[PDB]
Amino acid sequence: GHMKYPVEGGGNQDWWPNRLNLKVLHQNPAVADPMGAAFDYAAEVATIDVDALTRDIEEVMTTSQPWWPADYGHYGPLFIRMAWHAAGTYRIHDGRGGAGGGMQRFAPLNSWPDNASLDKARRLLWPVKKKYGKKLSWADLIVFAGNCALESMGFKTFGFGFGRVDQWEPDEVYWGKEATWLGDERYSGKRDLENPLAAVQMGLIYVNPEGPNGNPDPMAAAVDIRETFRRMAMNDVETAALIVGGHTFGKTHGAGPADLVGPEPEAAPLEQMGLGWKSSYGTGTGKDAITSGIEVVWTNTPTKWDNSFLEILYGYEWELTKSPAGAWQYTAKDGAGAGTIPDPFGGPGRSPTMLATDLSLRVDPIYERITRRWLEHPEELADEFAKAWYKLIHRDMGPVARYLGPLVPKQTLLWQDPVPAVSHDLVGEAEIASLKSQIRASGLTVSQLVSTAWAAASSFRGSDKRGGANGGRIRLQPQVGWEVNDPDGDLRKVIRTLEEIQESFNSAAPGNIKVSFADLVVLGGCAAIEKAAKAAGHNITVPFTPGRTDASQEQTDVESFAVLEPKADGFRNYLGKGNPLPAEYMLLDKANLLTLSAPEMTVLVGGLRVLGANYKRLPLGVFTEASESLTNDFFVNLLDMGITWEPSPADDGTYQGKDGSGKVKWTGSRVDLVFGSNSELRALVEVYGADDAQPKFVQDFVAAWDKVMNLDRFDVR
Amino acid sequence: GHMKYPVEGGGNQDWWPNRLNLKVLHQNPAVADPMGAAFDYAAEVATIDVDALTRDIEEVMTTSQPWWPADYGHYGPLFIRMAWHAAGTYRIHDGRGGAGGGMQRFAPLNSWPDNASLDKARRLLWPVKKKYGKKLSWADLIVFAGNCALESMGFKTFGFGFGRVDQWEPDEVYWGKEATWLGDERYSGKRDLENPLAAVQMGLIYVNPEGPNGNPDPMAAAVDIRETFRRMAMNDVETAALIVGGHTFGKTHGAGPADLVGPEPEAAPLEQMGLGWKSSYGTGTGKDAITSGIEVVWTNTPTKWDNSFLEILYGYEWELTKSPAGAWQYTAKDGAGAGTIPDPFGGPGRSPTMLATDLSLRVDPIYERITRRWLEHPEELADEFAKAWYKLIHRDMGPVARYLGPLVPKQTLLWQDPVPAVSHDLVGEAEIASLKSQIRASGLTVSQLVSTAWAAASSFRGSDKRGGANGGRIRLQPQVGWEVNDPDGDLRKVIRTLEEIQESFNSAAPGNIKVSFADLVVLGGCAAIEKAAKAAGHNITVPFTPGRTDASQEQTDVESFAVLEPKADGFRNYLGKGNPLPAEYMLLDKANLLTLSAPEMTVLVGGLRVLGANYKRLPLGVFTEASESLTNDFFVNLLDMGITWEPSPADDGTYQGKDGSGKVKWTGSRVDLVFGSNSELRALVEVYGADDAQPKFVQDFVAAWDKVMNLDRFDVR
């Protein structure tokens, strides 16, 4: 190899290829954002005329452009696919992907083989973006264009929430390790898909439309469809509803040989102005378009909602055939239905066709029972598709407080992890001071109160904005039993004690003030930090914002919450089994999901160690002589050249720190020592370990702690 | 190949290896910075107690630590090498490197082979960092410890300025293409060293101490010494003084086989706490130390300043021998001077020894005249070494306003590109208004005024902070003759007219107010921009900070300024010959040197195009019908899918943009079209090209313009 200039991507990872990349903690830096620090998308979206916007998108949909002529004179179905692909990268394992950042317009997603032609689709929406400007994000517009397409073609949707803020550089996400587009190095066993991945090959949305590994066996395709859609949060009813709903519209494109299609947009020359897949087959567009290489028109009304998809699926028998580009697809046997399927540019009629993955809906016995019913009950298909589409387009939006504008329906939905509305007045200063005292007199320790509040709050992830302390779900399944949370039972003592305090305060309170369990979990941590800070010679106040409410078990989907269980949390020195990478990488990944900067991660780790937040109160990294005192001791001792560190002879992922006596003075994990070893982290440690640093550390610690407590608090911002 | 998690370095660069890397415009992002937003290092260090600092460094220097015992009981010489290496990465071609940012403490420099053992040196200084905290940067401390070491051992320095601001992530710099440490792929012709490099091998500071590619020929080593030092701004006298003054102290380290030395710091395990090169030879340290693998002690007084180096160099005859580790060095012939050189830990005395590169100073005939003169007149050496050492450790400091504290000498130095002190009252609001009017009435066009101001101001580079509009050098050599500034002599007309306005203003002025030519150059741009924005319907005031002064030609080192000449300036659509990369890369590189973000670079390109700032007023990228009007037409037209772009038939770096008829409506360069093609830049173009975006564009353009006009204005910060 050769090293490149930095402007062509050269840097330190070339010389140390497996090095920790702290850039995941400064994604989307403010200086790359053109809008400026006062920009307030919620205030701008509030201003939009949604009816006019809807009419502007209908005009785009029926006005054919000569650089990509509209099949059947309507871009609606292309826009449904656009919207479906935008939301269709979502994965449950880490909550990454999905439409909430408009990441389809950036690398790598803008150039995935499965997003071929979406470069033209998005481009078609520039006239609408141009007219609304800062009032409308690309993120909102891409999925709103699909929703408007559904409605303009006869399908009434359940609603729509605006509010996705545009970003200015791509979210960098692990999409798999294959270095060849459409490569597959992600299966083992009989058919176990590598976590956290939710598609079958690199650069596909879910499955291969010619069947697993290009082999068109619809039964085997079904296995893939069911698993990838599960990992995108869809069950069997949702998955069938979505496939039938989508393929009610439009057509594939495979008019000619794919080797006449040129490079994807990130690799295409400048004069293409950000478009890719430039084709030399015929005109390269429209009648001659090549996108997937399959050539299927599913229904006899590609620009109308009706039940034709299932009528065709079940009204014909099917046989394998090949598309003009050499892909497997299915056609009706016996020459049936000849001429019945309309051409997108006024050519002659054609025969019924289907994808291998569409036959899956008839071959797989579970999907077969679901879709056979819809054959006779289209009203149920319509109901299921409206619910699954809404979920699809909003799955990564987070708490319903964030959904903006006039089309949000009011019905609660279990998948939104709903919390109750506030029903009483909220605690004010006096009531908060009082409850801080009760908590401090309750016999719960600093370590118990801080660990419990951290376990509640740090369950949030900023990818899909699920989790956090609102809801009080630490006392419900499954969080109440997660290993990191409740190692040996002590969690239930804390829960019971805080419940006793809620009960007494609520029995006696001023008027109509009541406090939730969820709020006391957080308030106990804050009170404990005030106590630890005193212990250390600081009179401080830890901010606290009331307003959390208490969800019930029935409002808490246990299976859905399973993906939020930490398998690693370096903030508590917890490392479970099954992580993809060593502990220091998992720490940064955890810090990234909590939206923490590197300074924020650093102070939190140092403060939580000395407060006793560790899992099972282990002494790893607890570099202090003081009990329950909030000092910068972690930083000071980490930097002390008087300590000689070595891996423990147990080979148990721990290290021993010996003083000059040769006595083991401290012990630590990889997560602990990385702050002393990594040159950029150790630079931060040196800020907090200096002699003048103690007030700064407390201030920064409290701010970072307050951030984590408020992560899910979109109800009050 | 395999794709990696982002936390392990994975990203879009893996799929498109040569993609333009926009991360070079958001380096050292605020979110990675642990210090306050209000944090002002200059304010902090300005209050430091320098005498106390000096005493504390002196105590570190004479207190041996067990994990790296001090040679001769004094770490001074090690610290001198440390400071010399911190400053010694500097290079004139781009101004990158040098000690100004404390980059030695981060990758890759902390792990360069030439920087072996300075991991320990920097670690020795943590007690001082700890004590002074935010009042003392690592960047200042590393070079200040070298300066104190010199004074501690009897050499009076010229002075010292504090104020180097710590950074939190490494500067990412092109250090060469070699992908092996000590690799050499950087020579062509007879011995032409690749620009912008200033070292003979990857990971060396300047030259190979065993001679060119390890051949210990002193005469040929002298060719490399002279050229690498020249590329670090040092002539023959300065180079000889630096080498002699440096090797007056301390010793090399090569006690044992180098294959017993473990991985460099960035590759070492966690338990070494950021140290590297752990050695299993004997104790690994002190008397068994292994750093370069050479074992040379130059003088009989390694912890004292005197004329021993040159007395030894000239008082013996030398013959080639091998160190314990097998490296080439020189030792006195015929057993002369046996036992005269003291051991670092009290062992037996040893014989005189020199590096091949030290013999260069005696064998090369230029150096021999210089150094024989110093053998005979040693007080001349002390004066040249003071001057040269001061220059070395301050070369990248920028304007002398940045130098802070009580050690800063008063004397003016040519290499500081000095400007006169302000000597009259400055123009205030009324005078600034009146001059704007007189400039707009002078007959000079908007294009001429914007071009001239841009030329003067955009010569600043934020690497070594040289250049900028202060000094009025646009009218002196060499700036007045640079091809990009003055293609066909139109600059001189502007200059004459602005001098006429200066002289008539000053001879009429109220009171003691006078204005400089340098201010009028910038003020003229500002007035042209107000005029152009009014033509487009905006009434805006362009900010303007007076106080630049006018240097004379005698105060302007013509050769030193040669390196500031642009060979590319995309903001003017100028591409000279000889650039290392295609024009869009050179554009972002110029933006990085201007300290611009991606939004700022974007608005400036689009504004400058329509203002007529292009070199030779070519129409490339001038996507407007209006003359001299500050509109957002660049962005609107770039996004016009009614234009079809193709490389021009002449293979000449340009494109033709044809409209519906097939007539050529626009032409543009690679720099113009990258904004339409690159997915991240096109996002920004889409902000500024929306129907609502004209006011925001004018405002952001004006703020970006102001930024560039004030780049070198450290006198008001």
Ligand code: HEM
């Ligand atoms: C097992 C899951 C799925 C598979 C294998 C699949 C496969 C495909 C393929 C290969 C294409 C053709 C692309 C081209 O050549 O132009 C296509 C188009 C389309 N997909 Fe699906 N799809 C799936 C699910 C969905 C879902 C869930 C939706 C929406 C809810 C959807 C909506 C569409 C639409 C409307 C089109 C037509 C696009 C146009 O008319 O230009 N698909 N799909």
Ligand code: HEM
């Ligand atoms: C042609 C240029 C130079 C070459 C090839 C060179 C080479 C070397 C080498 C190989 C070492 C041994 C490192 C080790 O094994 O510990 C060394 C040490 C040293 N260098 Fe030079 N050097 C050069 C210029 C300079 C300059 C300009 C200075 C300061 C102004 C300097 C100051 C020192 C000092 C003080 C030491 C001794 C460090 C100690 O005692 O630990 N050198 N140099």
Ligand code: NA
């Ligand atoms: Na239909």
Ligand code: NA
């Ligand atoms: Na000496």
